[PDB]
Amino acid sequence: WSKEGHVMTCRIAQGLLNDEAAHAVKMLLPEYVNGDLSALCVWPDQVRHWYKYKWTSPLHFIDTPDKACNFDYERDCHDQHGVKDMCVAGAIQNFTTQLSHYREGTSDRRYNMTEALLFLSHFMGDIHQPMHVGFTSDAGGNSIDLRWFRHKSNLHHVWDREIILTAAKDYYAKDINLLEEDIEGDFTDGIWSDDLASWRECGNVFSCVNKFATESINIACKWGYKGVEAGETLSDDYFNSRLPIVMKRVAQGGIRLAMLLNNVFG
């Protein structure tokens, strides 16, 4: 996700935290954001480009083989140089494990919990963006150049931002708070209300991130690359049809995140 998906994922996520998980996140965050996890959820996307954190480059996504439309961890979860574990699935396990050393305080200074908090949170949102588990050769839709209404863009960016900016301008006067309030609603008393417990049962972290990944490449094959030719124009038909899918994954990411943190801090 771009700024917007992450902010909503995290606001949603923070509102569902138990007492132990709220206390931890407040303490783990710098004063200048007033306890607001959302304020920093983009942080990993900034440092993505610093030589220092070059190593975080591949942890944002998974590249699956073209047209295969499924996710296999040992096949997929690696970087370009075949280095095992380097993919958003790995990172979530990694940063969740790091965070389990917080309460007991048993990692000395090998880890930074604040950074582990922002990576976990951020990457929880990325793994639900269906185009973060897309095809290798086209870079999760990045190198499928298209037009989204009256400006150049690309499929990956349609899902990272366009559908969300578009929805917020057309229906909420650009106010993202409002778009979130409705997304928050559609699973509390709304179309996804009967599904919360179902979103919350995936097993241990490893299984969960595999479930989430799988979900994403299905959505990507069914709704992402379907009905998309390069150079063409995606209109009201693509937007209106996919709006609620994007919205679902914003919610799923958030509910799923609150569950992890709740467990890591409990």
Ligand X SMILES: *[C@@H]1O[C@H](CO)[C@@H](O[C@@H]2O[C@H](CO)[C@@H](O[C@@H]3O[C@H](CO)[C@@H](O)[C@H](O)[C@@H]3O)[C@H](O)[C@H]2NC(C)=O)[C@H](O)[C@H]1NC(C)=O
Ligand Y SMILES: *[C@@H]1O[C@H](CO)[C@@H](O[C@@H]2O[C@H](CO)[C@@H](O[C@@H]3O[C@H](CO[C@H]4O[C@H](CO)[C@@H](O)[C@H](O)[C@@H]4O)[C@@H](O)[C@H](O)[C@@H]3O)[C@H](O)[C@H]2NC(C)=O)[C@H](O)[C@H]1NC(C)=O
* Identity of the residue, 18 or 57, whose beta carbon is nearer to ligand X in the bound complex: 57
Radius of gyration, CA atoms only, the chain: 18
Strand 233-234: give its sheet, edge to edge: 151-154, 145-148, 233-234
* From Zn ion, ligand Y, ligand X, none, interface partner of 160 (C-beta below 5 to 8 A by class): Zn ion
- Distance CA(104)–CA(19), nearest Å, equals 17
* Identity of the residue, 219 or 264, whose beta carbon is nearer to ligand Y in the bound complex: 264
Q: Does 151 appear as a known binding residue?
A: no
CB of 106 to ligand Y, least distance (A): 16
Please give the DSSP secondary-structure letter assigned to residue 98.
Answer: H
* Identity of the residue, 30 or 82, whose beta carbon is nearer to ligand Y in the bound complex: 30
Contact (CB, 8 A) for 50 and 115? no
* Identity of the residue, 43 or 172, whose beta carbon is nearer to Zn ion in the bound complex: 43
The token pair at 162 is: 């366009």
Contact (CB, 8 A) for 121 and 258? no
- Distance CA(64)–CA(116), nearest Å, equals 26
CB of 233 to ligand X, least distance (A): 38
The token pair at 14 is: 């923070």
CB of 111 to ligand X, least distance (A): 5
**Where does this chain touch Zn ion (CB under 5 A) — which range of 71-79, 121-129, 142-150, 254-262?**
121-129
Contact (CB, 8 A) for 48 and 60? yes
User: Does residue 162 bind Zn ion (CB under 5 A)?
Assistant: no
Contact (CB, 8 A) for 250 and 170? no
Task: For residue 137, give every residue at least 6 positions away whose Cβ sits within 8 Å of its Cβ, in sequence order, or none.
Answer: 66
- Distance CA(222)–CA(216), nearest Å, equals 10
Q: Using CB under 5 A, which of 1, 71, 212, 238 touches Zn ion?
A: 1
Site string for ligand X, 110-149 (x = CB under 6 A): -x--------------------------------------
CB of 211 to Zn ion, least distance (A): 19
CB of 37 to ligand X, least distance (A): 19
- The backbone torsions φ and ψ at residue 206, rounded to the nearest 5 degrees and listed phi first, read -60, -45
* Identity of the residue, 52 or 150, whose beta carbon is nearer to ligand Y in the bound complex: 52
Contact (CB, 8 A) for 96 and 11? no
Q: Using CB under 6 A, which of 33, 55, 143, 188 touches ligand X?
A: 55
Q: Does 132 appear as a known binding residue?
A: yes
User: Does residue 90 bind ligand X (CB under 6 A)?
Assistant: yes
Annotated binding site: 1, 6, 45, 60, 108, 122, 126, 132, 156, 160
Annotated binding site for Zn(2+): 1, 6, 45, 60, 108, 122, 126, 132, 156, 160
